[PDB]
Design a protein around this nucleic acid. Structure first.
Ligand SMILES: [Mg+2]
Length: 173
RNA sequence: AGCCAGGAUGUUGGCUUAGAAGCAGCCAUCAUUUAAAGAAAGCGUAAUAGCUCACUGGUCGAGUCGGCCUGCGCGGAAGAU
């Protein structure tokens, strides 16, 4: 578990050479008012600043909860340090949040989607496969607190489903 | 009606924004020092800044303002021997 945590934390370090240098560059050339006179430049700096800002708030957890863990977590987990081991649960959560953030933020990523499922060759077998696939996606939606709206469903003759087109809506679908 | 002066403070109201400081918007449209000063009507900017305006004090020293009813006119109004 500890090892896993460490591994997770290493990713966060992975974005230390990005944040510092970038920040420095931004303050050095972009922050300036005579650079600012061009809107595009300003916009660029703002984008650049965004990168910096992400790195600031979320790295603290990685550093602050790592360094404070070892002194109290070493020998005792059950007695007196039952808070102190599940104190690192908070850290884990933070890490997860960071990772998830990294994953998302990209174009159109919040707006819900409408996946069509199309079968392949095999004919009868294939339709069953399609159905199975559909089922899995439905269950995923169910799992993740989504609401699925069933639009197209088309049965195949010998068995299964030929064509389906399923639209789910909610939080970063 | 010109003319001379002010045209402030909390305050750059917060935000979301890239930034937003009356003036991109979205929204609240309040209170201060009071003669009076819009969380701002226009220009202006990255945006501030800056330049006007509202209202208000002075100067001057008689009429003035924009509706209503009706009279007669103007524009709108270009064609082929
Ligand atoms: Mg006529």
């Amino acid at each position: 578990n500890a090892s896993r945590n460490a591994w997770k934390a290493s990713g966060g370090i992975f974005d230390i050479p990005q944040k510092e240098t970038r920040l420095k560059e931004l303050e050095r050339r972009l922050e300036d008012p005579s650079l600012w006179n061009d809107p595009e430049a300003a916009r660029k700096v703002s984008q650049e600043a965004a990168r910096l800002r992400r790195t600031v708030d979320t790295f603290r957890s990685l550093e602050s909860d790592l360094q404070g863990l070892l002194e109290l977590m070493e020998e005792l987990p059950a007695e007196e340090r039952e808070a102190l081991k599940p104190e690192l649960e908070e850290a884990a959560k933070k890490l997860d949040e960071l990772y998830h953030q990294t994953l998302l933020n990209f174009p159109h990523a919040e707006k819900n989607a409408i996946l069509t499922i199309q079968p392949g060759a095999g004919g009868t077998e294939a339709c069953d496969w399609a159905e199975m696939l559909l089922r899995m996606y439905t269950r995923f939606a169910e799992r993740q607190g989504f609401q699925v709206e069933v639009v197209d469903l088309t049965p195949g003759p010998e068995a299964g489903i030929d064509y389906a087109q399923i639209l789910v809506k909610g939080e970063n679908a």
